[PDB]
């Protein structure tokens, strides 16, 4: 049994997730596609994937990427368009949350700047297939091509998928990650921290009310440990992606705002999206 | 051996084939691709498209491979715009091939149109056979490949034609001689100079027959010429079948390029074939 606010808190996060997560990716359209230095290449080989695109008629386009030999940056324009679409649903997810919109406009930008990558990877894990190693995104599919676990990103997705979390546990991780008080640029550190502690208490209470099996022992502490690991991966890959942008500019205008390439003035797209409605 | 006129007859056909056959399909660009998105009229159309089912493969300069798996069953009309662009590109190379031949230029412009109107499909299949892989079942057109999908395929005469013709393992000179015999068919609709085209076709047949006698062993290729003539006869029937299959599909779903509309009878001999007439002047 959870308190009435804990029940209300989960139902709002669940309602916000349903309204702002295009799990079928049907509204993802107008995306770039592949046409018909030593420190950089070591990272891209781990996340090498093949792109599949199913059609409403039943046809299947399949893209096998070129081998290792300006060929490792062919999928990045598409992945930038995909990451931007995912984050636009993340922004809408934050706007629906009542505790988020009541924050100052600068804190809303600072929180989304620090949780952009983390909240996308949590939503990506829900469409990740453990056996096939494929992120099934409705019309689109991303299939990979023992040693991969050395890459923290792939290792994070396999460990998180192994926990077999509920929808409520996924959206609570998004709330705990979004309401991080120690993000760069946050002013209301104390108010955001108070909000984060309530999401953690709600997550801890939910697990005790629905997970009696021994496979889920210490599950709350595992989740909190995964959120810390995901925070480190965020710092690694955000620093890594700036090197690729430095050599081959590929980021969309919204991704450029999130990287640093007044807050409301240099984050014009993010400011406009926070003022717009559903 | 071969007579000096027959030797020069092969040299001209080989020269015409070399100048007009983009064997690597390097100049085939700007083509359409399948996008990322009464009752007896359709019933007869579905039977035609399910016969030949191929998957499209696109190799890239960097090493990437785009692959298109066709759908099942207005969904079976996804590959037609691409094949219309491929056929038109092949037709233009066939027209240029005939224009290089001196025996073809001396014919009236109407007989040139009539011969090209009846042998356009046949000469493309002969060129397509040279890039067909019997083992993999794929037409390798350089960066483009067309792999078939399921004796299940021998039922269609078109696929059976390519496998039987490939088994003969014909030379380049024998292939280009088949094109001349097929191009100079005197019994095409609209042909006027029946005797010239018939005598010209007989000389190409004699040259092809004499070429086999002088460049092949004695007992092994004793009937190779008659096998070739049988394949040309079978190929003429496939042309009549395919031409009728395309008119039914075009009537329901227009996909024909302007050049294909003229060669197939869709809307004087030069009044209804203005595009084909212009390509013969230049
Ligand atoms: C389902 C597709 C995804 C998949 C899920 C983990 O994974 C990838 C797999 C392969 C590749 C290759 C290009 C190497 C082939 C990439 C990814 N993955 C990504 O391309 C990516 N995933 N997240 N982000 C990202 C997003 C952000 O917010 C918009 C952000 O903040 C601005 C920073 C980000 O990166 C540090 C990217 C660029
Ligand atoms: C391009 C590869 C060589 C192959 C030889 C028979 O070809 C075709 C392959 C596939 C198709 C489908 C429409 C069934 C996809 C047609 C052709 N064949 C023509 O597209 C054609 N050939 N002559 N006229 C047409 C419309």
Curated annotation (Swiss-Prot), chain A:
Annotated tissue distribution: Expressed in liver, colon and small intestine.
Please name the GO terms of the biological process aspect recorded for this protein, alphabetically: cell differentiation; cellular response to molecule of bacterial origin; intestinal epithelial structure maintenance; intracellular receptor signaling pathway; negative regulation of DNA-templated transcription; negative regulation of transcription by RNA polymerase II; positive regulation of DNA-templated transcription; positive regulation of gene expression
What GO molecular function annotations does the UniProt record carry, in alphabetical order? DNA-binding transcription activator activity, RNA polymerase II-specific; DNA-binding transcription factor activity, RNA polymerase II-specific; nuclear receptor activity; nuclear receptor binding; RNA polymerase II cis-regulatory region sequence-specific DNA binding; RNA polymerase II transcription regulatory region sequence-specific DNA binding; sequence-specific double-stranded DNA binding; zinc ion binding
Q: Tell me the keywords, alphabetical order.
A: Activator, DNA-binding, Metal-binding, Nucleus, Receptor, Transcription, Transcription regulation, Zinc, Zinc-finger
Question: What are the subcellular locations of this protein?
Answer: Nucleus
Q: What residue stretches are annotated with the NR LBD domain?
A: 5-261
Residues given in the record as hyperforin binding sites: 83, 121-124, 237
GO cellular component annotations of the record: chromatin; intermediate filament cytoskeleton; nuclear body; nucleoplasm; nucleus; transcription regulator complex
What this protein is reported to do is described as: Nuclear receptor that binds and is activated by variety of endogenous and xenobiotic compounds. Transcription factor that activates the transcription of multiple genes involved in the metabolism and secretion of potentially harmful xenobiotics, drugs and endogenous compounds. Activated by the antibiotic rifampicin and various plant metabolites, such as hyperforin, guggulipid, colupulone, and isoflavones. Response to specific ligands is species-specific. Activated by naturally occurring steroids, such as pregnenolone and progesterone.
Can you tell me which family this protein belongs to? Belongs to the nuclear hormone receptor family. NR1 subfamily.
* Subunit-structure text: Heterodimer with RXR. Interacts with NCOA1. Interacts (via domain NR LBD) with CRY1 and CRY2 in a ligand-dependent manner.
State the name under which the record lists this protein. Nuclear receptor subfamily 1 group I member 2
Q: Which organism's genome codes for this protein?
A: Homo sapiens (Human)
Task: Report which gene this protein is encoded by.
Answer: NR1I2
């Amino acid at each position: 049994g959870l308190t009435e606010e804990q029940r209300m808190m989960i139902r709002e996060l669940m309602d916000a997730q349903m309204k702002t997560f295009d799990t079928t990716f049907s509204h993802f359209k107008n995306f770039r596609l592949p046409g018909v230095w030593s420190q950089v290449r070591k990272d891209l080989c781990s996340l090498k994937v093949s792109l599949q695109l199913r059609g409403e008629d039943g046809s299947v386009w399949n893209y096998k990427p070129p081998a290792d030999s300006k060929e490792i940056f062919s999928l990045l324009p598409h992945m930038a368009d995909m990451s931007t679409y995912m984050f636009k649903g993340i922004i809408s997810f934050a706007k629906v949350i009542s505790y988020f919109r009541d924050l100052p406009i600068e804190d809303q930008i600072s929180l989304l700047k620090g949780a952009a990558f983390e909240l996308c990877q949590l939503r990506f894990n829900t469409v990740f297939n453990a056996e096939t190693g494929t992120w099934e995104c409705g019309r689109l599919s991303y299939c990979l091509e023992q040693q991969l676990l050395l890459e923290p990103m792939l290792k994070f997705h396999y460990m998180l998928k192994k926990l077999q979390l509920h929808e409520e546990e996924y959206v609570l991780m998004q709330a705990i990650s979004l309401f991080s008080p120690d993000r760069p640029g946050v002013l209301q550190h104390r108010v955001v921290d108070q909000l984060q502690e309530q999401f953690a208490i709600t997550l801890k209470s939910y697990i005790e009310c629905n997970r009696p099996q021994p496979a889920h022992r210490f599950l709350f502490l595992k989740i909190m440990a995964m959120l810390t690991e995901l925070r480190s991966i965020n710092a690694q890959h955000t620093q890594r992606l700036l090197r690729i942008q430095d050599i081959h500019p590929f980021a969309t205008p919204l991704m450029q705002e999130l990287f640093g390439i007044s807050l409301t003035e240099r984050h014009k797209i993010l400011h406009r999206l926070l003022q717009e409605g559903s």
